[PDB]
């Protein structure tokens, strides 16, 4: 569902990357070449599943349909015209028009899409914020209104809706400690957390897949979880703008409440770092158990 900002092309990147780097001798070479827009081994599965994956994700790719869809190339170059000239946007989106309906599978599809990937390496790298130079650009420009990297994506909405200096900030105190607050401002807030670890979706979907993934990372069953998300998702409220809040309430006032706190605080985590897990998938091991800006909470 594009177009895609930078940050959300490196979540699709790093995500892709976590999910189907191999696990032995061949990871920190597999990454270093992946990370470069270098996509091989060719006849690897995992090279083949990162580039289906990547592919499926920006919607390049339509596992429904069963055919590339060239729309979000168009998407991307009307969002981001610095990105592209119009000739060699128009000739990759074209090379990608004309593939041939495809079956799933990440061969199939890894293959489909590799002579384009070549013919066309610049002109996708550049447009998809895989141009470092350009995306640095982009980040300085944007500033505190995008998640930066190395940033925590909490600590951007944070400072977007209670900034430091002002009378707000103080409320992080209750707000770090899963106080559910209930004014507009903490709603807005807790969208933007809530999205931004993908719970939520750009449509304002509940996206239980993701939920799951975050408690499985801290070594926790889902099937509770699973059933309280099932009751939260009946009681959903009608208000598109209070749809993650809902969700956020429901979860710290549930049953599964010590478990979430537990997974959403390593989520939090690893929201510093996309590529956490990159050159090797690390375990979790339950931290030992406030201030704010260095200045003490009441
Ligand atoms: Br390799
Ligand atoms: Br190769
Ligand atoms: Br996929
Ligand atoms: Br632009
Ligand atoms: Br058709
Ligand atoms: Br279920
Ligand atoms: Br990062
Ligand atoms: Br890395």
Redesign the pocket.
């Given at each position: 569902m594009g177009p895609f900002d930078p940050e959300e092309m490196l979540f699709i990147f790093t995500r892709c990357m976590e999910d189907n780097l191999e696990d032995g001798a061949?990871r920190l070479?597999?990454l270093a070449?992946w990370k470069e827009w270098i996509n091989?081994?060719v006849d690897?599965p995992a090279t083949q599943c990162f580039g289906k994956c990547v592919l499926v994700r920006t919607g390049l790719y339509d596992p429904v349909a069963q055919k590339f869809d060239a729309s979000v190339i168009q998407e991307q170059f009307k969002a981001y015209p610095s990105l592209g000239e119009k000739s060699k946007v128009e000739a990759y989106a074209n090379a990608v028009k004309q593939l041939p309906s495809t079956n799933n599978d990440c061969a199939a599809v890894f293959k489909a899409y590799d002579p384009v990937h070549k013919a066309h390496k610049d002109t996708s790298k550049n447009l998809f914020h895989g141009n470092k130079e350009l995306t640095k650009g982009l980040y300085e420009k944007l500033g505190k209104d995008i998640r930066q990297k190395k940033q925590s994506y909490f600590e951007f909405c944070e400072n977007k809706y209670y900034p430091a200096g002002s009378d707000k900030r103080q409320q992080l105190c209750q707000i770090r400690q899963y106080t559910v607050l209930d004014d507009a401002l903490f709603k807005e807030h807790t969208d933007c957390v809530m999205k931004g670890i993908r719970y939520i979706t750009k449509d304002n979907q509940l996206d239980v897949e993701e939920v799951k993934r975050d408690f499985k990372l801290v070594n926790k069953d889902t099937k509770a979880l699973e059933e309280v998300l099932n009751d939260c998702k009946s009681k959903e409220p009608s208000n598109a703008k209070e749809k993650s809040w809902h969700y956020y309430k429901c979860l710290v006032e549930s049953s599964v409440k010590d478990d979430f706190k537990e997974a959403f605080d390593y989520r939090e985590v690893r929201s510093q770092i996309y590529a956490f897990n990159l050159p090797k998938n690390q375990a979790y091991s339950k931290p030992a158990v406030m201030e704010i800006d260095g200045k003490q909470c009441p």
């Amino acid at each position: 569902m594009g177009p895609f900002d930078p940050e959300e092309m490196l979540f699709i990147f790093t995500r892709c990357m976590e999910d189907n780097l191999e696990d032995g001798a061949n990871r920190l070479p597999m990454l270093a070449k992946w990370k470069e827009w270098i996509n091989e081994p060719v006849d690897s599965p995992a090279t083949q599943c990162f580039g289906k994956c990547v592919l499926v994700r920006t919607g390049l790719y339509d596992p429904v349909a069963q055919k590339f869809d060239a729309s979000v190339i168009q998407e991307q170059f009307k969002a981001y015209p610095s990105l592209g000239e119009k000739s060699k946007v128009e000739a990759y989106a074209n090379a990608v028009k004309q593939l041939p309906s495809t079956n799933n599978d990440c061969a199939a599809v890894f293959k489909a899409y590799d002579p384009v990937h070549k013919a066309h390496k610049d002109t996708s790298k550049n447009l998809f914020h895989g141009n470092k130079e350009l995306t640095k650009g982009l980040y300085e420009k944007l500033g505190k209104d995008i998640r930066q990297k190395k940033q925590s994506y909490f600590e951007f909405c944070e400072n977007k809706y209670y900034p430091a200096g002002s009378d707000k900030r103080q409320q992080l105190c209750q707000i770090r400690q899963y106080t559910v607050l209930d004014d507009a401002l903490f709603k807005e807030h807790t969208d933007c957390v809530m999205k931004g670890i993908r719970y939520i979706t750009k449509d304002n979907q509940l996206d239980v897949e993701e939920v799951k993934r975050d408690f499985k990372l801290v070594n926790k069953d889902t099937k509770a979880l699973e059933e309280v998300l099932n009751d939260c998702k009946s009681k959903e409220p009608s208000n598109a703008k209070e749809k993650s809040w809902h969700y956020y309430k429901c979860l710290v006032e549930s049953s599964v409440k010590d478990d979430f706190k537990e997974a959403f605080d390593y989520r939090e985590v690893r929201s510093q770092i996309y590529a956490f897990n990159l050159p090797k998938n690390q375990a979790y091991s339950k931290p030992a158990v406030m201030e704010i800006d260095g200045k003490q909470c009441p």
